[model samples]
Target chain A: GSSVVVDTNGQPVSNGADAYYLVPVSHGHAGLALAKIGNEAEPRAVVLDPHHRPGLPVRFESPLRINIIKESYFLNIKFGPSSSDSGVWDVIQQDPIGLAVKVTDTKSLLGPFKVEKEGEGYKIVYYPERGQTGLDIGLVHRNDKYYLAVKDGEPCVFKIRKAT
Target chain B: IINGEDCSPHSQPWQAALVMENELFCSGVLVHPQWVLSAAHCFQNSYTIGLGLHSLEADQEPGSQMVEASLSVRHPEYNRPLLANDLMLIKLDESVSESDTIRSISIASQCPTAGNSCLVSGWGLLANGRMPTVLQCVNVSVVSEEVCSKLYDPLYHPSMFCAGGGQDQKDSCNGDSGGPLICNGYLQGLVSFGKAPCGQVGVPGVYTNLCKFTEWIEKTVQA
Candidate 1:
């Protein structure tokens, strides 16, 4: 399994407690993904501008990615192989960086990576980091400031003019 | 004509030139069925590409039509000062049917020797500060590439090339900045500059080498 590198503010991530699972998916900026709560709850998706937003788009014509931050607790991951319209949905833990088990991948029946349970929520861990070397991450810039809310306002502009 | 220096006596006239909004200023060379090479800066907009019939000083024939260019892509690295790579391709909305005076200049692979003689033609004024209102051709020579690169800071990039008369007094002058310097019957350099005073000795008339930038021309034309 490959190890994920995390950093803080501008420094390498030193404390595990302070870091959140930063799962980076190589999806074209046009695509969106969403997240949901515990059982079959509805998920909200989000999208961003390709140019001013990120460095560039990577279709990730390859395998998917998954990340686990606090032990078997909460997890962050690329939702699925949805179209460019799929938005990235973020789920928050009551503890901010809480402790609970979460499964990072969907391909559960693929042997070795089966789901497991812990506490009220199931802590199912599956999927190992795939191939290494020759993978050029040169195209995209996965960043932190991306998830932060755009500060109050020089007027927000999107497909919709005003937010209701 | 000097008795000893290598120079050629030539005469080449052009029929189609460019005219602007109430101003006959732009000039071009007919190169192919679908392309016309002209100065990048001289290219006005899609609205003002005139074809056929010369003489902007007075009213002329009206057979030639004005067609907005289908596409006008400037050279990505066209330099203005030294006029390095001051070239661009103009694709007509329609191909040139009349082949009488319209033709393409044969571009070559090498610059003529430092003293090799050549011909140039443009609408730039004569000695005085007045527009000729007609096309004019003059003889010049090829200078060493090394000499040109040192003279201009950014004039020697592979895409940025030049040719001119040596310190020889016989060289290109003003009004011909974006025209052509013809040698051995091939379009070698696009008229850019030399020294002032219309080819003063040692102030060679520098031109962007069309041969060196042949790939650029091809790409720009196809694009």
Candidate 2:
């Protein structure tokens, strides 16, 4: 049976609940997780090793209208706004492979996001709104470390758990 | 290294260790089949060259091989008590064969400039004396000569470069000396020294710049 992603505390992911998701490959290597790169006002959503800040946090977006449990329903991911700007995550170039997922204010590009069960965790798939067959979110190797970019590579499986 | 994380085992094939009585003391790099590049301050008479090693725990490290040094050549101008021209080259008793876990790296003909991102790897001492067995690596950037000189103004050297002591304050500590500062797939610097305490806030660690001595290094290898 398909189930919503659970947080570190084992709470089911729900709408508007800002939570953190730990990636599968972060166990022995660097503690890589979804992070906002560049300026905080409008940052690129990338999977960073969180070099100094071990307690680095991240977030995703769900419509404020419903407090429904997150799963296959079309939703969106984001890093909480750094300033007074929108933090919705978006990709470039018609959802091509190897493109970094950055935060954008463009409201029209939201959703077509869903999570599919991948073993005990889930794989996040995204493209453009209402677009068919969104690619699985994957990590792209750059500068000897992995960055979150949509690619035809190994899909990054993650399990969400809330922050303190 | 401070603010560093564990590296994928054997990923940095050029990583070499200076071991004394089977204990890792200083770290280094393999630049040629028979030559290793390290810091001059780690001058010692009885040390073995360790290749393909990751963890200090002997049983846990894979592809680990130790070879005695045929000779050690510390820079003629290096002053052990001073912070000038700290570099060294050690010739291995026998050249090591290449494997997935071990290989030589090339030294950069040109040096890295400010803002250039680089990575440093070593098994330096950590706070509370925690986690010294695993090789740690940190992503750092080169600090400009102008900025570096300003920080260490009273005592500085032209052949010394600074890096990684930014807001994050990530810098190598003791035992990290002799390790390589890799930039764009080339060996550009060697860990030389740092502040009184490692990872000092707003204080970048000094490295022995390779660009100034590239010709000498090439010549030394030839002879």
Candidate 3:
């Protein structure tokens, strides 16, 4: 019964912007990644990339890096990475991290599509959460293109941000 | 919370309560005292009950007669995410004396014979204006899982049973969730969830699959 709606903070782009669904390693090890708008087999979290916009230059001053975060809610992190694993410890077995934030120092918004936020400051949604687990965000370097992947054929969201 | 013929000799009610700031608050039940099963949604945190009394209105009367209750435990696979396995039992401070009017309802041995006739009663609101001062009971039929799922919407969980009149004019709803869905004097199922505008065609009253949790109830209560 949980839903997340994406808002374009007046960033100029196409109807289908590029974002990512990044699956992180439970304890920061190797994990799978997926793009948001791909097949359900390998899904991704909604992480808006700067260079995926139409007519936008592919080169930015710095590389884009995303912050992986989890927010606590009605859901619990399972012990195993896959649904068929152990019942006691869900694949993602950490108390929800709660709220995710992205901090960037920029005047105007950049993206593969239009993204507008209510507040005009140094903050953005960072990632669009589906109100559940296995979510990821990703960063890509192509016009109208973003990276996506899935583990055990399950889709998720990952986080990505501009490199400092 | 009562109406005519719905209370006393006709229907008995029980509830789960807790002492808050020296005051008692609990969820009431229509029947099945030994097994005071309730919605898992109401089980978060911790809760207890004051039993053996007909109404909270008599809290002042010393002879009001009540029992202190606690949640023994819950289903191992209860998922708040999908609301699956919405069943939990409240162990009483002590077992109540079994009698004709007050006693635990027996569970069914197998999936109800489908079209088996059933009944559900509660001291819930009557048509939005009247309240059953005692308790209320209604007669319904056991329904199919497929029909119930589609009518009630939000997809029906596996642990729940479905039943009710296929059309309007027959159902137990709203204040009736978690109550008993009785058949042949047995606790066939527990009132779970259903659609609004109570009892319309295609909409079935969803009930907790009591048979699935029979082991849990016996083990928890007996212990």
Candidate 4:
């Protein structure tokens, strides 16, 4: 029943049942494997050695769920927080010679973003913005279908497909 | 020194100062006679390697060797988010002349044992919060995996380790990126990053563990 919804190039599609997800294999490699979510490729566990924690928990709230291309630049997507303003989602490389990724915006949306557990799904809130307001981006998993739903927009369902 | 103290020029001979166009932007470590290891992000511009360096501006230091980079290879998996696989190997135009003041450090075969004391050296900022002309050395203890995972969850990965600024209050700051983190004479890590304003209480510095990529290092150097 695991599924994954990805907004690849602004097209919202779900990888239902056939969803393959990426997991850290080593220092520089990520392995693709079958996921456990209904139809989403979200991380099911935040593994701490000596114990394997189940599903995304409070401990998983700190890390960014950045979309990346292997060994290349981060995949930046344009999301409209407001219908009039389409902002680019980017992770700032804080250290010029190190890999400290930070998400920064000049205005109210400044600071790093985090993906936190919300009931059955996850709520990715940019702390700088959307902190006071309850409106935040939602990666909702409802009835085995993964949806990438913005605050006031339509949920883009993801349909997983094996890479051709 | 917890903050930073000056080191003798010949003490850490494997230390390298990566200079981009004439400005020292990042630090480096000599792993092979003709190969230097550094962070891949530092190569966005032109770069040169200063071997056996004590002072950043003083070029006349004894046993110092300067070499141009012949080739640079960034880890194929180095990406922007999560900063995973942030490694690069620079092939010098020619092999450096090994001397008492110039040498290469060995990469660790395994990760540094937790709680081990390691030495990080660079010509970065001094305790006064200013960049220094002479190299600064600081002793930092390798943090345990459990603690590191708790401190930097999700951001900290297998390829990286945490050290410094816990109880001892030492850290690797700006201008120290890509420097060597030597544990028991073996190059165990490289200065990857730290929190802003340099040293922060209880906030350990992050480093790229060299032991995790020994195979890649050997194959890349051989290739």
Candidate 5:
């Protein structure tokens, strides 16, 4: 069994049955997490929200013009799967820089997914391999904060106000 | 360029940086060889305290130590939105070796009256929102309780106080949280929060009043 997850206020969140929030173990103010919404059919990666339940789903194939809610900023991402790992996908920014959570350089390219229209909220999908189930991702409130296995991460918790 | 002057090294020996992992997050003050006082929100289990240091990207001026915090105790009444009781005490794993560069500051017995001159120091950011190598110091006048309460209104309380927020103001910004607010020779407040993008005109920075919690600090340290 793993430890519980906590919010920025140090309050505990009930664990999800399958997935957990992973805080990036990187340097600087890296306030981003990968939500592993398990089940094996559609495994995807999205931005973790420290205060709310579901994290912001990274929309793939399309450029999402997101005007961050809280602080008021734009979050642009180009989604894909890692050439290094078939199991894990990559969340890369349009600037050619990728969202990574491995090794020493936490500021590398790795995990980012595209969002598709689905249900009440948009469906977050990672197309690591074609003809296969896209990565299924979600956040599980466990322990003091949120975690979805390895061990994932955040340097600072922010709220994205709105998206265009 | 936040209308502040560059503080001379060793001028404020008690000022410390609260670094989380390898990143510099907030500012702190060394009150005892084994104790550091800062904002409660800045306390995290995975943090290390940097003492007697200057310059973020370069080597220290000797006698500086980056020590691990064995324990961090935030005030039980600490509220996030209201930002009340935002004080915290950091216990060093081992006592800091005091020297010309590293030393402790004295806490205030009472709050500073309005209009008193106080010095706030930190490695936060400039007007352009960039980090600086050397520490920055700003001299600000304490805002009267009546005025401060009026400004923050429902959010302001006795446990909190206000300072800075003037034309060409030298107020603490994003990274300056958990730093020290010194008046006379006594340690007074810890950088808590401010308006968005910080250092705004007429919007003074809020702090956790240290005098109101002196008893708590003594008791907690003893326990």
Candidate 6:
């Protein structure tokens, strides 16, 4: 049996019925949040203002299927492609710290994700391949801003929360 | 650039850096062999704590240690705008060994009132709006409660006190907290919260009173 999925407020999440803000669980400032690059229908996603505060109005794509999330299960997460577009997410192989996590809209590139509860908060796990386990999705400092990436020494623990 | 002057090469032995992906995040104080004391807001993201020596630019002065944060804990009710309880503790992945450059500091039971023996140190920001590659240190006086209450009446938080802002216009800025308010060889409180501008005449940067949180820190660590 796996643990139940809950929001930042510890409220159980209903399947695909509502939108949420996927916040870094260890993140302290309420001002910072996650968005798909910007508020546009872009492929790249990032958290705005690493210094903190609300900079972007963004939410993660809810699973189209009304399926419940369990700790033991891994799921593919994607946002709507504005009704016409049909790609997903992808990252390149790297050595400095690790790989970059970006959205691309291609099916083969969609990153499979999961959540792990660690007492105080949660961590979002992302792994591209269909084999082995996974990596915890964290923020990486690049281009003077923080990008969502994998294998970050400064790993981010994430929790899907309610939109403010 | 902030309100302080350059610290003479690792003078503050307990000084530490809160880092995220090689970027300097905030100032942290090594209070224990296994823990770092800092402002809660600095923990906005998980990162490693860089201890031993100074300079984020081209390595440390030796005795450097970068330990990943095994875990972190912020004050349960540490809300903002009225940020009184804005403190947190970062537990290191491994305990640090004491050295000439790497050492632990003790927290003061209380800060002196209107005394100029206090000092603070931290990082970043000013004129050109660039972050200081090295840590900045400054000497400041603890503002008296009477004047402090009037100065920060808007905040209306007792656990938070005022320090700095002297004849040299030594208040602080950096869009961040917080540094260590070291007094009498002990950490009395933290530097300013990232809410106000600096150099205001007679207006000191507000800091969290570490004295009140010592017991809290003790129980939190023990548990």
Best by lDDT: 2
Runs in model 2 deviating more than 4 A are: A1-164
True contacts kept of 4: 0.00
Point out the higher-scoring one by TM-score: 2 or 5.
Answer: 5
Give all candidates' CA lDDT scores.
0.41, 0.69, 0.41, 0.56, 0.58, 0.61
Off by over 4 Å in 5: A1-164
Which digits, one per residue and each the tens of the lDDT, describe model 4 over residues A139-164? 33333422233332321122122222
Top model number, TM-score: 5
If chain B of candidate 6 is superposed on the true chain B, what is its TM-score?
Answer: 0.90
Report the poorest 10 consecutive residues by lDDT, candidate 2 chain B.
B124-133
- lDDT string for model 4 (B1-223, tens) is 2377889767998888876546576788988898989876555434578887787654578677777875788888764335567689988888888898888888989778998998988876555645676888988889888888887775667878889867657887656778888888799988775443346688787888788899999999998
* Whole-structure CA lDDT of model 2: 0.69
Q: Model 6 clash pairs? A: A27-B44, A28-B44, A31-A53, A87-A105, A87-A106, A88-A105, A88-A106
Candidate 3 global TM-score: 0.50
In model 4, the Cα lDDT at residue B220 comes to 98
What stretches of model 6 exceed 4 Å from their correct place?
Answer: A1-164, B1-3, B58-60
The iRMS of the candidates, in order, is 29.6, 24.3, 21.2, 14.7, 14.4, 17.6
Model 4 CAPRI quality: incorrect
> What's the CA RMSD for each of the models?
22.6, 21.2, 16.2, 16.7, 15.1, 16.7
Off by over 4 Å in 1: A1-164, B1-16, B47-54, B57-67, B80-83, B153-174, B194-198
Per-prediction TM-score: 0.47, 0.56, 0.50, 0.59, 0.60, 0.56
* Tens-digit lDDT string for candidate 3 (A1-164): 11112222322111111222222323123232223343345322323343333211111100000011111112111111211112111111111212211211221111111111222211112222322333322233333533322222232232222111
In terms of TM-score, which candidate is stronger, 3 or 6? 6
Residue B168 displacement (Å), model 2: 1.5
TM-score result, candidate 6: 0.56
Candidate 5 chain A worst ten-residue window by lDDT? A62-71
Across residues B1-223, which tens digit of lDDT does each residue of candidate 2 receive? 8888889888898999886656565788999998999986666664688888887655666777888885888888875224578888998888789999989998888977899999999987664334466789998889988988887765478778889877887888656888989999999999976553356678788888998898888999999
